[PDB]
Design a binder for these strands. Sequence first.
RNA 1: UCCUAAGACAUAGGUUAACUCCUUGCAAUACAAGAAGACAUUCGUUUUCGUUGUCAAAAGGGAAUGAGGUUAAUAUUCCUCAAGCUGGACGUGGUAUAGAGCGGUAACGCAAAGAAACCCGGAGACGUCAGCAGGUGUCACUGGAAGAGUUAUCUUUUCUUUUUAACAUACUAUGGCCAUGAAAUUGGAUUAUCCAGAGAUAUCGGCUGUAUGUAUGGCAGAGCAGCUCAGAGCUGUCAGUUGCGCACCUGAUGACCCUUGAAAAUCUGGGGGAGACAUAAUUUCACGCCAGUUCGUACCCAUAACCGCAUCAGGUCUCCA
RNA 2: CUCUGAGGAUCUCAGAACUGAAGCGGACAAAGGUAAUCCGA
Lengths: 66, 108, 143, 123
Amino acid sequence: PKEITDIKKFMKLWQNKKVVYVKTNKRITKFKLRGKKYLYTFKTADPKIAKGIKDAIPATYSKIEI
Amino acid sequence: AQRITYRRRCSYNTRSNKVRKVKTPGGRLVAQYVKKVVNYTKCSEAGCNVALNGIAQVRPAEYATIARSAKTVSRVYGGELCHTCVRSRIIRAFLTEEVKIVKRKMIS
Amino acid sequence: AKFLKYGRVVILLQGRFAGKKAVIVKSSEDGTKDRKFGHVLVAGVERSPKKVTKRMGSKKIQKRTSVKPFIKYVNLNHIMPTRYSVKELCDFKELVKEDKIKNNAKSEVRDTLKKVFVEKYRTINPEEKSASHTKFFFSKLRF
Amino acid sequence: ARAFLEAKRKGRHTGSGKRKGTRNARMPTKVLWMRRQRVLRRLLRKYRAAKKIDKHQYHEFYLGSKGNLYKNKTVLIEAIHVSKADKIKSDKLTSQQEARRAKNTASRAKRNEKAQIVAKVDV
RNA sequence: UCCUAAGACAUAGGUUAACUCCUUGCAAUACAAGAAGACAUUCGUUUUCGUUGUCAAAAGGGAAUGAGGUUAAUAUUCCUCAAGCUGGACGUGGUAUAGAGCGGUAACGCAAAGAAACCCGGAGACGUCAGCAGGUGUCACUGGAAGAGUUAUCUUUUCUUUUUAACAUACUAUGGCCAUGAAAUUGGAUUAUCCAGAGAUAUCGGCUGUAUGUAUGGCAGAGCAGCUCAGAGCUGUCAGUUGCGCACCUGAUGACCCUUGAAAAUCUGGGGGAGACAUAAUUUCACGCCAGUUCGUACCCAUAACCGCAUCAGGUCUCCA
RNA sequence: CUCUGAGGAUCUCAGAACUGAAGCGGACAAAGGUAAUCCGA
Ligand SMILES: [Mg+2]
Ligand SMILES: [Mg+2]
Ligand SMILES: [Mg+2]
Ligand SMILES: [Mg+2]
Ligand SMILES: [Mg+2]
Ligand SMILES: [Mg+2]
Ligand SMILES: [Mg+2]
Ligand SMILES: [Mg+2]
Ligand SMILES: [Mg+2]
Ligand SMILES: [Mg+2]
Ligand SMILES: [Mg+2]
Ligand SMILES: [Mg+2]
Ligand SMILES: [Mg+2]
Ligand SMILES: [Mg+2]
Ligand SMILES: [Mg+2]
Ligand SMILES: [Mg+2]
Ligand SMILES: [Mg+2]
Ligand SMILES: [Mg+2]
Ligand SMILES: [Mg+2]
Ligand SMILES: [Mg+2]
Ligand SMILES: [Mg+2]
Ligand SMILES: [Zn+2]
């Protein structure tokens, strides 16, 4: 499992059978890409990055929420 | 107090058979098999025995897994010798040829 | 007693360039605000010319001769002061540019020297007392 | 258990009649020594770092504590105050000279003891 | 299963009426015994280098996995989730070169940065004991929260839970190096030794090596503890401190020998630069595609599953506390 | 049992007083000595 700090690489990865898993925690939110040998997590604190990334969900990738 | 169980069918305590106690998300204390430590890489010259810098100390296998960096250094003998030995080598070779030529001209 | 002179061939001792031969362009007894220790500016053979047979062909003999020069600053302490000297092989005062070095022009000087050396090497004159040395400059040292 | 540790800490339950092991057995001498040495050396380091002592004083005192000359940390401290106060030159003296030096040192001591008093009054 | 050991056995040669017996790793009491490459791709052709076997370790060496869940009985094997390894074979990006990365004075650094014979290395790879230092697990204590025990009296009480796998990235880690400068009113330093002009100490100095360390990912969605509803639901799983405490591991040492403490397979590095190649050639970078066969996995391991004519007061090698 | 002092970081040691059927390593744990003679170091 790898995690990503900078949204850019994350977006290069979800731009590269693709599905995206978003999960809510009290203080934080996480976005999760499945790829052959790695599970990519992306965490953010503030709601701005949050909504912005929710926007970022493309038609190619389907969004699952737990 | 939690007690453990070997997981390997080798109950005898051997340097290769060592175990470490790990605490799981389950709340269990589980034996996990710990690997063996290896000796650091030393310069190969006679009587030298210096610990080489900038090379990884890794169990022999993992040596196929690492990046070129850890396998090497940038000198003339990067992997095999330390700087001191390199240096003394250079110097010795140069000066020895000098004496060689000198003997040559003194012969002719 | 001091021999730092422009044109003295020295060997680099420890460094990625350790074991290579090069000539002193400039010598700063105590150095700049930049390098606060005693150092020398030097131009030398990084990769030496490969051996050339009398049986090879044109393209072979030409390609064989390629030289890759380097220009480095080296603390004098990392240097072995060879007694061989080549002053005239080129004007290093001319081709070694404090500017070009600091100015991100490194590759330019590289080219210039490659040109110069390659030219000189095949042009080596067998009667030159300058040449007995020249050979050694392009010589390969054995450790 | 806790109640006992309580009383043991107040000191009610340690006695000779309550001790089964050797003094050395309970706490081994070597530990006490290591602890003392370590204290003394940590101190000498603080001091030599703060310029209060010089490399010669450092050395002499280091070998001082190595020689069990100082039981307390307090005592090493007193003897540092002494090396500072007494001139560290105690070589080649006639008894006249040492009497004089003694009285000069006694004078200094009295002096500063006095000041150290007066400053606490005004505060 | 592979590797080598103490060892052992073929083959070859010799001995015996014969059976049998003698040698063989430092390999022969033997010897016209091999391996590789390429084109060919069969042969053949051709090239290169060459004296000649095998078995013996379920504690030695030894490529890579973990947590959670499940059965009446198996599970580091099945399920779920998350990883790594070796061998394949191309795809897409990217390094490098008209010969073959770039930075630093230097230790050294950085996803990648051409190659054969050949010769040398490193790891593997190692005794006993003594003390020091650190880490893990455990034990102890502190505030918070949920539950439980006690309550005639006393007890802001007594107990319980309060967890984090392999693996990914970044940092720190007992040592060693590199500068600069050299030390006598010698200094530095350990519990102990011990080090220095063969360069000590010291610099807003620098480089490097080891985690059973820290943070984040894994991860809470799992596990754990409570409380509801009639399979669904809700709440909390938080923040600290100390130990010559204990078991194990690691790090730096010290002492000891008319004792001086395996080897090979395996992974990898260096020196060398013969060859190969323009529409080309070759390259320890990423991400993607394929595979992992055979055998053992139940259960007892003992005052009742073993050996002692037995369900015998005997005997029988280990780990966790 | 009630006090007192000393050793340390950003758990040991020593004093004094009081109190008991003069008991108190209260179980557990845990050498009996001495002087000679003979062997074998
Ligand atoms: Mg996978
Ligand atoms: Mg003890
Ligand atoms: Mg053998
Ligand atoms: Mg034999
Ligand atoms: Mg294995
Ligand atoms: Mg599996
Ligand atoms: Mg692969
Ligand atoms: Mg040893
Ligand atoms: Mg509590
Ligand atoms: Mg350090
Ligand atoms: Mg939950
Ligand atoms: Mg300890
Ligand atoms: Mg043990
Ligand atoms: Mg030895
Ligand atoms: Mg090489
Ligand atoms: Mg029995
Ligand atoms: Mg008393
Ligand atoms: Mg009394
Ligand atoms: Mg009694
Ligand atoms: Mg008797
Ligand atoms: Mg006897
Ligand atoms: Zn060396």
